Design a protein around this ligand. Structure first.
Ligand SMILES: *[C@@H]1O[C@H](CO)[C@@H](O)[C@H](O)[C@H]1NC(C)=O
Ligand SMILES: *[C@@H]1O[C@H](CO)[C@@H](O)[C@H](O)[C@H]1NC(C)=O
Ligand SMILES: *[C@@H]1O[C@H](CO)[C@@H](O)[C@H](O)[C@H]1NC(C)=O
Ligand SMILES: *[C@@H]1O[C@H](CO)[C@@H](O)[C@H](O)[C@H]1NC(C)=O
Ligand SMILES: *[C@@H]1O[C@H](CO)[C@@H](O)[C@H](O)[C@H]1NC(C)=O
Ligand SMILES: *[C@@H]1O[C@H](CO)[C@@H](O)[C@H](O)[C@H]1NC(C)=O
Lengths: 195, 596
């Protein structure tokens, strides 16, 4: 084993991207050792769909996709197939037949500056519901009424709102970092396996 | 997009911006009440002004959506609460006049001082100077001096301000399409659009008066018994058939007869249950008190306090340099932040207050899932009623013995039960005629049924007739004795204390039945009963989302306020009072006065 999959960057990045513009990293052509994942952070909401976690070292996939972002405590449960809300509807939606794992852990220490960590935004309004595995980084003013908007107004709203993360909040409002691993095997031989 | 859909999106934008701005104002207000500095006063004002300006802007924007075109009632409730004009319906000149009158009356009340004769320097404020006199002094003349001087030197300053206050408040209420300012206040109990649960503003007057007629027999025997005991202490001051002198009632106004307990105690040789010595014997601290309170709510199926509660609250006096406002309060800053501010001492009173205040926290955590505009009690009397029933169970000997503060060998006889019920009636029953008569006077003043040249004349005719209390000094129309109370000169509705009192015994009687309690209602402890906790939580989580008549029905099974549980609580005393008054005159003559 000489080429370990670079999980040292996904679970230990200096800062994570906003949920509406969640970051996607591709992991391939490497040996995947998930046993070290528990050493990265005290995982709170580890959950795998379509695959038993204890057998993660005994499977192979063509490519792995890590989608990393930051949400609130209440919105962690929205990261699941067939779920609805704000994050699952207008920010980041998983397919109904999703296969992979979800790892969510608290980051109250790194994403709470006591004055409002307003660098993490989420999409509040959208014309339609987000398609699975789609990013909508568009920043056009949202129209709620019938009049033209061409900018902010009484019924013309900015689609993105900034989280007000602070360390004084409860566990339900403290920021949580989420990494969703999706496993894919289309045609190519699996370049990702276990030890 | 329809108007209702635009309002749902408008309320969606409002909730997220309000929760942030409300948290900034609540945190800045917390840092002042826990660290009274000059920098914290400005930061509290700056954050409070930004929150007040945000509401005024959103109220105008909310008034651009016609309520008639909204059919979803949960959306209409949030729009209706946000569209409430209030003082913003008057002209800018009249609203500026009204806010100046309100600030002056609050300043006159909080700064009004009375100086003893022959020393223009030895002056006393209401708190603590005059209040200490009205609560501890047994001297007739000393209490008469404090009672009269507070009303002739501070109340007379409020008389001209209160006349213009009624005019502008009536113009404000009538511009909001209300009959008068009293009808405006009664809108807190109004319910429309819900078949079988509606409630009109005028119905509150009829229900308060109807239930008060059933309280009269209990109060007359409590009044007669108190008069007899006080007549033995002041034989030359009290008539056996007249009303009670207003300055001999336990406080500045007779709002509570609690302090009359020393002179009216039935069996003055059996001591009260005071587990304060036991708490010090067991090295209890403030954290132990709140931990025991936390265990209480957990025993009935309610959640434990959040980690941020134990970390952010101030459960002890900061002491030394850092000063703080030691009044016990429960804080719901929002966004999962719940705190309790309290300079807790190792006493039995603070032990029961901790259960009273943590009950407010349980209420807040329950409806925290509701929208921002629906996070409150069902009406103005719900929140305080939930806190009262917690100290009811926590103070019983059954509960005090189950936690190791009261000795198991300590037995309770019917003489200590009467002493407890009499102490309770002096505070609970003694305040109901005071509260109803005061609020009825303001209802009639706002309605225009009492002319200005007969304000004080009608005020004391109703004190003699309804409350059975006579003024010791004749007062002309230069006085303003109602304004000598905080709530009247600071513009607060008062009927909330009448409805809350009847609510809490409805709650307690219902929860104790769910707890399968046997025996008198006053000995009940709902501890370890998850069934009672489930029945209470079914109303706490509602918040303001449902009509208060429906929220009340989830606990007690009835849609309206009921006085029978209150009478069921005091029945062992009522039968004892009637036996004590067999050779005494029950009732009062309104023509007798101590200055006749
Ligand atoms: C209270 O205010 C004083 C005045 O600046 C400050 O020195 C102190 O640290 C403050 N205490 C807290 C707990 O904020
Ligand atoms: C009213 O609107 C809320 C969202 O604002 C929705 O959850 C609820 O189901 C609606 N109720 C009815 C009866 O349409
Ligand atoms: C608010 O006041 C305006 C006039 O200032 C009035 O037309 C409107 O009906 C009022 N609305 C409410 C909800 O009080
Ligand atoms: C409440 O009690 C449960 C155990 O019943 C515990 O797991 C939880 O951490 C407690 N909550 C807090 C805030 O301590
Ligand atoms: C409640 O249960 C606890 C044990 O769970 C017990 O110690 C306590 O005495 C009980 N109290 C009552 C009033 O039943
Ligand atoms: C208390 O009960 C005893 C009998 O158990 C009775 O003789 C006495 O009169 C009662 N006293 C009161 C005040 O009820």
């Amino acid at each position: 084993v000489t080429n370990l999959c670079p999980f040292h960057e996904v679970f230990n990045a200096t800062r994570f991207a906003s949920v509406y513009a969640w970051n996607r990293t591709r992991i391939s052509n490497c040996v995947a050792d998930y046993s070290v994942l528990y050493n990265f952070a005290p995982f709170f909401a580890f959950k795998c769909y379509g695959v038993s976690p204890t057998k993660l070292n005994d499977l192979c996939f063509t490519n792995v996709y890590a989608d990393s972002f930051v949400i609130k405590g209440n919105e962690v449960s929205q990261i699941a197939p067939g779920q609805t809300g704000n994050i699952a509807d207008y920010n980041y939606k998983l397919p109904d037949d999703f296969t992979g794992c979800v790892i969510a852990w608290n980051s109250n220490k790194l994403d709470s500056k006591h004055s409002g960590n307003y660098d993490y935004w989420y999409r509040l309004f959208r014309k339609s519901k987000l398609k699975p595995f789609e990013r909508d980084i568009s920043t056009e003013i949202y129209q709620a009424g019938n009049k033209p908007c061409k900018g902010k107004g009484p019924n013309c709203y900015f689609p993105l709102q900034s989280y007000g993360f602070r360390p004084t909040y409860g566990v339900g409002h403290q920021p949580y970092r989420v990494v969703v691993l999706s496993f894919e095997l289309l045609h190519a031989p699996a370049t990702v396996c276990g030890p | 997009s329809t108007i209702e859909e635009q309002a749902k999106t408008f309320l969606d934008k409002f909730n997220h911006e309000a929760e942030d701005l409300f948290y900034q104002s609540s945190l800045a207000s917390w840092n002042y009440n826990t660290n009274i500095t000059e920098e914290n006063v400005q930061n509290m004002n700056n954050a409070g002004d930004k929150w007040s300006a945000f509401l005024k802007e959103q109220s105008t924007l909310a008034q651009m959506y016609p309520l008639q075109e909204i059919q979803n009632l949960t959306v209409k409730l949030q729009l209706q609460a946000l569209q409430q004009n209030g003082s913003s319906v008057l002209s800018e000149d009249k609203s500026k006049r009204l806010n100046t009158i309100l600030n002056t009356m609050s300043t006159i009340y909080s700064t009004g001082k009375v100086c003893n004769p022959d020393n223009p320097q030895e002056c006393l404020l209401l708190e603590p100077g005059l209040n200490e006199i009205m609560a501890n002094s047994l001297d007739y003349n000393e209490r008469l001096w404090a009672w009269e001087s507070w009303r002739s030197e501070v109340g007379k300053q409020l008389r001209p301000l209160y006349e213009e206050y009624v005019v502008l408040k009536n113009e404000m209420a009538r511009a909001n399409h209300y009959e008068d300012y009293g009808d405006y206040w009664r809108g807190d109990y109004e319910v429309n659009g819900v078949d079988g649960y509606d409630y009109s503003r005028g119905q509150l007057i009829e229900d308060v008066e109807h239930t008060f007629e059933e309280i009269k027999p209990l109060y007359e025997h409590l009044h007669a018994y108190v008069r007899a005991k006080l007549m033995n202490a002041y034989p030359s001051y009290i008539s056996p058939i007249g009303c009670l002198p207003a300055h001999l009632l336990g406080d500045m106004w007779g709002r509570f007869w609690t302090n009359l307990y020393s002179l009216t105690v039935p069996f003055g040789q059996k001591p009260n249950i005071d587990v304060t010595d036991a708490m010090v014997d067991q090295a209890w601290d403030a954290q132990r008190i709140f931990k025991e309170a936390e265990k209480f709510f957990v025993s009935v199926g309610l959640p434990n306090m959040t980690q941020g509660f134990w970390e952010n609250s101030m459960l002890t006096d900061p002491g030394n340099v850092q000063k703080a406002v030691c009044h016990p309060t429960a804080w719901d800053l929002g966004k999962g932040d719940f705190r309790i501010l309290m300079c807790t001492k190792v006493t039995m009173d603070d032990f029961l207050t901790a259960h009273h205040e943590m009950g407010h926290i349980q209420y807040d955590m329950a409806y925290a899932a509701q929208p921002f505009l629906l996070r409150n009690g069902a009406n103005e009397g719900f929140h305080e009623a939930v806190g009262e029933i917690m100290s009811l169970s926590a103070a019983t000997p059954k509960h005090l013995k189950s936690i190791g503060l009261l000795s198991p060998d300590f037995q309770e006889d019917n003489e200590t039960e009467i002493n407890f019920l009499l102490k309770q009636a002096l505070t609970i029953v003694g305040t109901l005629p005071f509260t109803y008569m005061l609020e009825k006077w303001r209802w009639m003043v706002f309605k225009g049924e009492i002319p200005k040249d007969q304000w004080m004349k009608k005020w004391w005719e109703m004190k003699r007739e309804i409350v059975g209390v006579v003024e010791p000094v004749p007062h002309d129309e230069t006085y303003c004795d109602p304004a000598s109370l905080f709530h009247v000169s600071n513009d607060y509705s008062f009927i909330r204390y009448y409805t809350r009192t009847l609510y809490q015994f409805q709650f307690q009687e219902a929860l104790c039945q769910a707890a399968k309690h046997e025996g008198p209602l006053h000995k009940c402890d709902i501890s370890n009963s998850t069934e009672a906790g489930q029945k209470l939580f079914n109303m706490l989580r509602l918040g303001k989302s449902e009509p208060w008549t429906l929220a009340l029905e989830n606990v007690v099974g009835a849609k309206n306020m009921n006085v029978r549980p209150l009478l069921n609580y005091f029945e062992p005393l009522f039968t004892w009072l009637k036996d004590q008054n067999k050779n005494s005159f029950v009732g009062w003559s309104t023509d007798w006065s101590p200055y006749a």
